[PDB]
Ligand binder design. Structure first.
Ligand SMILES: [Zn+2]
Lengths: 96, 110, 122, 420, 100, 330
RNA sequence: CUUUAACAUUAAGCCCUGAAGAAGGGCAAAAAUAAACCAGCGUGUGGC
């Protein structure tokens, strides 16, 4: 069943990704197995510029966090729910 | 700041027409779509969870079993009928003959 | 299916003396030779016999069934939870035998370690 | 007799989860149709077929009633005494066994009754699928890509259809693409397409804002109105209940990072997330978010909302074909007129001159009273006779018979216009 | 569907069915003329059904008869006479009708 | 039509045939008869010729009189009356060009009288036994000189890229339009004014009257060789409804099936770079098959199973005591 | 560091007709083609 399962989890907004993490914990606990994580990462800022006109003579810090989910004993219902769910637009649910 | 529409500059080309005609006249009466013919369907979606649809998708397995049952029963009946109606006679041949003949009629053509 | 390459023609090795003629014509299902003239059939040319022996040399596989695979090709996956889904491979580890395929799910690349038998080369 | 019917039953013998006694009830209802009203007038029949032995029991009965009419089906109180009070007026229970007669037309209509029962069973199965799946976000892999529609297998051997008008005009998918859609329509009785899926209706946008932002589902932000023109422009109205949360600032989100992802779903379609207001004019002022609104004159009796725009802000407010402000009309529910400076000045002078001409022509009055009626704010003749007298008796220089004569002239003018 | 030798023929009167028995065949010795029915044969006529389930029920329950086109052997025009002999030949496999 | 004067006749151009037809037959199978719908792109069809029933798509979509003109897309069939089934031609695009059988074997040989070449030579050119020379140029050989394989091989030794020598129907087709028409007329008129021998003047007056009539018409020497062969509207050669099972075939349908099978096999052999002997044999088979279709009498060969009679070709539907002049039009 | 961050939306044309941002078209560019309901032909024989 490819039992060695790695998940990294990106977070721009912490509330939306905590909601998605609670949904992952729910859809992992309602199928039989037990889930581990997140063990979160500290503040990893980004280097992203804006499209603004230059001055003739915004944002700089993007607080992104990472979360870790390890699965070692899955079921077929667990991976089915991981292949029959829906998510919010713009966030990553990448099962590494 | 684009304003790169053909109909906009064509209306601006005929601005003298809408300047001459709209002297003590209204400008436009254009109705839009109304929310009466739109079901909002927003009574309750809190038990309509995404993970609960993940554990429980829709199902028509019983439909496939029923359709396979209909196909198998019909195939058995039609195989039996095409087995005992187009059989092969043995060592002697067709023991009768068809003899069918069709005559003519007097058919008018109004 | 298995198609005959030439419908209703037989290629035959000969030396063409008249005994060979009446040997072939005394075979119960044989219509006459197809040559430039009667009493002397024309032999087929040499580039054509090289081209007809070359057109039976395409049935040789293994290499490359599954064990030699390139990175950066959008292929499919048929095993695991990613069964029958498309994705772009990132690198090909021939030593570890683990393809790092980013399956394009929800319009998003999801990388996963898979096998050569667990993917479909498309 | 019983061998053919038992062969039909064993032929239609489905699984134990599927109804098999309703098949008995449907075929005996067909027999009761071909035997009760046969062929014109006028008897009664009961028929019951067991499942174990497969032997029909056709009790040809008559309805127990003591009514002075319908003598063709009546049983008096003496057989009710023989029953020892287990039957009353309306039931029919007795035991005259009649053999089941056949015909071409009876077998034909029995076939019709059973195949309509099977179509109603298909309808029941589709409704049983539809109760859990009234409307959801589906995520399916395409089976066939036809020239008019594509189908989706949503697990456990099901199918859903979506045509080209429900999609975006530039969607051309491939086998192996998890596409997402909304079930919106169903026709279980129809043999053809029974599960209609869309991607270009604004209920998809409602579901996107429900999945994306949690507090809308948590009864904090109220989305009431929405409108779209797919790929180009859309508007949606939000309203907070908790004053602690900005509704527009959260539904837009940080840097617009949420709705831009929704713009990923719709392909660049500019979605104006605006604030809902109870006043419709102030709501339309709030609704033109990349635009500016000067003043709105609302006359719902004439079904008009005249919107004044500032100079220079005409092209960004109107846009393409006047559609988005029309979408704002679809966001408001009322007819929002297109906003233009000189055109609305011409329309206001048109309304003023039409009011002056109607007051000086159809009322038979002087100039000063018509000047008062123009300067009050009454541009039509409808608010002069149906208005209460508390606003007309306060007019100085006019006593009661004069204003009664003026109301009589106004009612006569309305009767003249209504009969013109 | 197959064809029947039944006495059930639509669009005809009762009087033309009088010389027939209930099995669908005229009696030995009934003096018939030109035009009357000798042997009543009927054919199925759909035309467009196309249902993969209705045809299962029609082939068993529906008499093998849904809509009927008349194909009865009738007497040719002009000829008359007296029916002196009838023969019935049944394929091995179909049960014999009672007149056979 | 009505109100028409004199009947006009001439040869038929390939572009005239494409102006006639309404589709290209590709499949040699008539009908499936599992269900009795006609097979698409067969000898019978519905998208090619017309509707099977009256005012109905073959798919069975539009069945109402107020939908006339708009075709279906389920079947591609224009909703029209079945009289259209009697009147629309068809065409077949041949793989190889093909000699007409009448103009070869009317016996005054039109090809032979035109090219000043005996008939038996042209016959053993068309049935793939020789070569002709088409503009040999700086060559010992002349134009109308014919060879065998051995003279062709020795010429390939000698003038290996000088002469242009082909064989089969394409070679005759090359010789026909390579010839002018005005120059032959004026040269032979001057030669007849420079001739007193009688039989030479007989043959040359025949040849110049042929050429003058051929130029005063509209047509051309390319058109005696077929490239696109037309087929008859399929109500005019109907398939015989038997009683029990299969349908009885006509003669024309068997001949068209044989021609289309041969044409498809030759087209596939050209698709796979076949050796030269097999494509020569296959072109000879196709030429013989069209000669069997147009007039079965010159090669009395096409006989069917269980009835060893000659099948009725198209020319047998006109002559005799049963063709359309003596039988049905008088 | 003293009591939860966020205003976004930059893309699809040109021209003609038309009371308009009601509607009808062409051109620079392209993935892709259930139902209420009138009614013969080929052999033989024989005859003239
Ligand atoms: Zn069609």
């Amino acid at each position: 069943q490819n039992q060695r399962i790695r998940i990294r989890l990106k977070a721009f907004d912490h509330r939306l990704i905590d909601q998605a993490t609670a949904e992952i914990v729910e859809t992992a606990k309602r199928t039989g197995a037990q889930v581990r994580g997140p063990i979160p990462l500290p503040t990893r800022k980004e280097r992203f510029t804006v499209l603004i006109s230059p001055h003739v003579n915004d944002q700089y810090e993007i607080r992104t966090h990472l979360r870790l989910v390890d699965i070692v004993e899955p079921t077929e219902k667990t991976v089915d729910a991981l292949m029959r769910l829906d998510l919010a637009a713009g966030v990553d649910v990448q099962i590494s | 700041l684009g304003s790169m529409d053909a109909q906009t500059r064509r209306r601006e080309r005929r601005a003298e027409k809408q300047a001459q005609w709209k002297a003590a006249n209204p400008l436009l009466v254009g109705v839009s779509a109304k929310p009466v013919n739109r079901p909002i369907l927003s009574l309750n979606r809190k038990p309509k969870s995404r993970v609960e649809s993940a554990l429980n998708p829709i199902d028509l397995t019983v439909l496939a079993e029923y359709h396979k049952q209909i196909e198998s029963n019909l195939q058995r009946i039609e195989r039996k009928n095409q087995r005992t109606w187009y059989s092969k006679p043995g060592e002697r041949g067709i023991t009768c003959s068809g003899r069918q003949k069709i005559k003519g009629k007097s058919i008018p053509l109004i | 299916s298995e198609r005959k390459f030439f419908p209703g023609y037989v290629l035959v090795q000969m030396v063409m003396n008249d005994a060979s003629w009446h040997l072939v014509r005394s075979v119960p299902r044989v219509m006459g030779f197809i040559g430039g003239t009667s009493d002397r059939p024309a032999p087929i040319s040499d580039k054509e016999v090289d081209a007809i022996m070359n057109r039976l040399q395409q049935v040789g596989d293994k290499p490359r069934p599954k064990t030699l695979f390139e990175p950066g090709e959008m292929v499919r996956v048929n095993d695991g939870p990613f069964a029958d889904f498309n994705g772009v491979v990132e690198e090909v580890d021939y030593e570890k035998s683990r393809l790092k395929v980013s399956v394009s799910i929800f319009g998003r690349a999801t990388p996963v370690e898979l096998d050569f038998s667990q993917v479909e080369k498309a | 007799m019983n061998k053919e019917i038992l062969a039909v039953v064993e032929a239609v013998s489905n699984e134990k989860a599927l109804p098999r006694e309703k098949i008995f009830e449907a075929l005996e209802s067909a027999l009761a149709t071909a035997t009760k009203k046969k062929y014109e007038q006028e008897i009664d029949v009961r028929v019951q077929i067991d499942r174990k032995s497969g032997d029909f029991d056709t009790f040809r009965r008559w309805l127990v009633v003591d009514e002075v009419t319908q003598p063709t089906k009546e049983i008096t109180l003496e057989a009710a005494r023989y029953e020892d009070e287990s039957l009353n007026l309306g039931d029919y229970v007795e035991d005259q066994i009649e053999s089941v007669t056949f015909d071409r037309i009876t077998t034909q209509t029995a076939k019709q009754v059973i195949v309509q029962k099977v179509r109603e069973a298909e309808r029941a199965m589709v409704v049983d699928q539809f109760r859990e799946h009234e409307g959801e976000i589906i995520t399916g892999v395409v089976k066939k890509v036809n020239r008019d529609n594509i189908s989706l297998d949503l697990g456990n051997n099901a199918e859903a259809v979506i045509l080209r008008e429900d999609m975006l005009p530039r969607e051309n998918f491939r086998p192996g693409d998890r596409v997402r859609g909304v079930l919106y329509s169903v026709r279980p009785e129809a043999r053809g397409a029974q599960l209609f899926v869309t991607r270009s209706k604004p209920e998809m946008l409602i579901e996107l804002f429900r999945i994306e932002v949690p507090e809308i589902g948590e009864e904090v932000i109220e989305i009431k109105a929405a409108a779209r023109d797919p790929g180009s422009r859309a508007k949606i109205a939000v309203k907070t209940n908790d004053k602690r949360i900005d509704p527009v600032g959260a539904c837009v989100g940080m840097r617009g990072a949420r709705v831009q992802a929704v713009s990923t779903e719709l392909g660049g379609e500019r979605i104006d997330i605006v604030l809902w207001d109870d006043n419709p004019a102030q709501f339309v002022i709030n609704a033109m978010a990349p635009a500016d609104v000067a003043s709105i004159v609302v006359d719902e009796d004439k079904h008009t909302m005249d919107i004044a725009v500032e100079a220079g802000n005409l092209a960004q407010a109107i846009g393409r074909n006047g559609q988005n402000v029309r979408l704002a009309s679809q966001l408001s529910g009322w007819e929002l007129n297109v906003m233009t400076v000189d055109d609305l000045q011409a329309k206001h002078q048109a309304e003023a001159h039409a009011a002056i001409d109607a007051f000086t022509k159809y009322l038979d009055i002087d100039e000063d009273f018509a000047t008062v009626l123009v300067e009050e704010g009454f541009s039509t003749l409808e608010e002069l006779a149906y208005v209460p007298m508390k606003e007309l008796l306060e007019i100085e220089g006019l006593d009661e018979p004069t204003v009664e004569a003026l109301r009589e002239r106004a009612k006569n003018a309305l009767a003249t216009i209504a009969q013109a | 569907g197959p064809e029947e030798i039944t006495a059930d023929i639509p669009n005809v009167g009762e009087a033309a069915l009088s010389k027939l028995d209930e099995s669908g065949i005229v009696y030995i010795g009934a003096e018939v003329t030109g035009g009357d029915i000798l042997v009543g044969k009927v054919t199925p006529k759909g035309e467009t059904q196309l249902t993969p389930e209705e045809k299962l029920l029609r082939a068993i329950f529906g008499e093998k008869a849904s809509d009927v086109k008349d194909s009865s052997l009738r007497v040719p025009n002009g000829v008359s006479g007296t029916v002196i002999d009838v023969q019935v030949f049944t394929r091995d496999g179909v049960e014999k009708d009672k007149r056979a | 039509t009505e109100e028409f004067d004199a009947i006009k006749i001439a040869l038929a151009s390939p572009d005239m045939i494409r102006s006639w037809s309404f589709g290209e037959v590709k499949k040699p199978e008539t009908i499936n008869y599992r269900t009795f719908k006609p097979e698409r792109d067969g000898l019978f069809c519905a998208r090619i010729f017309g509707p099977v029933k009256d005012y109905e798509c073959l798919c069975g979509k539009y069945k109402r009189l107020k939908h006339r003109g708009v075709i279906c897309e389920k079947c591609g069939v224009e909703v029209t009356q079945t009289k259209v089934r009697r009147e629309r031609m068809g065409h077949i695009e041949l793989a190889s060009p093909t000699a007409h059988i009448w103009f070869l074997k009317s016996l005054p040989s039109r090809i032979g009288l035109l090219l000043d070449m005996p008939l038996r030579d042209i016959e053993r050119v068309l049935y793939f036994e020789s070569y002709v020379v088409i503009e040999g140029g700086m060559t010992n050989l002349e134009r109308q000189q014919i060879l065998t394989e051995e003279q062709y091989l020795d010429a390939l030794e000698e003038f290996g890229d000088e002469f242009d020598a082909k064989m089969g129907a394409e070679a005759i087709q090359a010789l026909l339009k390579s010839m002018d028409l005005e120059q032959e007329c004026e040269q032979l008129r001057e030669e007849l004014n420079e001739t007193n021998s009688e039989t030479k003047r007989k043959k040359l007056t025949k040849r110049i009257k042929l050429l003058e009539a051929f130029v005063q018409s509209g047509n051309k020497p390319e058109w005696m060789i077929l490239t696109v062969l037309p087929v008859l509207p399929p109500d005019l050669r109907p398939l015989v409804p038997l009683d029990g099972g299969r349908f009885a075939t006509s003669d024309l349908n068997d001949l068209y099936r044989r021609v289309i099978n041969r044409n498809n096999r030759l087209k596939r052999l050209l698709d796979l770079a076949a050796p030269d002997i097999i494509v020569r044999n296959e072109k000879r088979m196709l030429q013989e098959a069209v000669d069997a279709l147009l007039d079965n009498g010159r090669r009395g060969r096409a006989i069917t199973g269980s009835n060893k009679r000659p099948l009725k070709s198209l020319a047998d539907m006109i002559k005799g005591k049963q063709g359309r002049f003596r039988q049905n039009l008088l």
